[PDB]
Design a protein around this ligand. Sequence first.
Ligand SMILES: N=C(N)N[C@@H]1CCCCNC(=O)[C@H](CCCCN)NC(=O)[C@H](Cc2c[nH]c3ccccc23)NC(=O)Cc2cccc(c2)CNC(=O)CNC1=O
Lengths: 154, 40
Amino acid sequence: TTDGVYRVMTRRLLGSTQVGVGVMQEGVFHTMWHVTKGAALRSGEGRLDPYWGDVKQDLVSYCGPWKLDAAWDGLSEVQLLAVPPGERAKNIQTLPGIFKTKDGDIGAVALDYPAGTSGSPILDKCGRVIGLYGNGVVIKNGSYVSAITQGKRE
Amino acid sequence: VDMYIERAGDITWEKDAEVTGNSPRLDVALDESGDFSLVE
Ligand SMILES: N=C(N)N[C@@H]1CCCCNC(=O)[C@H](CCCCN)NC(=O)[C@H](Cc2c[nH]c3ccccc23)NC(=O)Cc2cccc(c2)CNC(=O)CNC1=O
């Protein structure tokens, strides 16, 4: 349960596949619902069980409630700490755009990575996780734009 | 189906990082299945 960013892997008959990424903070593992669908996660010799989740937000937490509460300030550049399959973690700085919805504006990053990068954290200048990468849209030219998806710390 | 996690790094901001990507302003809707779509 050590703090940090983690790959989410599946092993079948021979070899592993990276299906996503997540954040360990305050003893809770945070990822996007579509990465695990709530399946239990092996961590070393231990097992992490789903505690909370929401399909519409596309989020899930393990071991306890959602802990990430930093918010994009609507103004500043952010960094995607991308953890792509088969590649070392790397920071990519960007100025978010906006998903304008009937329920308010959501920051959104125009950065395109493999599906198994889902759950990679998006950071503010203090290194706080302001959301997770990977629930988004494909625009007319084929490019991808991800919401900065953040949960509520109850 | 063995699903498992493995550490990939520390969560820190990188000074003097590569800056890329545009800043699109998109009208979108979110359905109850958690899918965003562009509004026509
Ligand atoms: N240029 C690209 N297509 N880049 C994407 C980047 C993926 C980043 C991580 N996120 C995801 O995997 C989620 C899962 C699903 C979460 C659902 N709530 N995904 C997405 O949000 C997008 C957007 C989307 C949501 N709901 C949809 C319904 C219809 C069409 C698109 C979408 N989903 C896709 O982009 C799917 C897609 C469509 C066409 C071709 C490809 C992939 C081939 N690309 C890859 O095989 C790797 N790249 C890609 O897959």
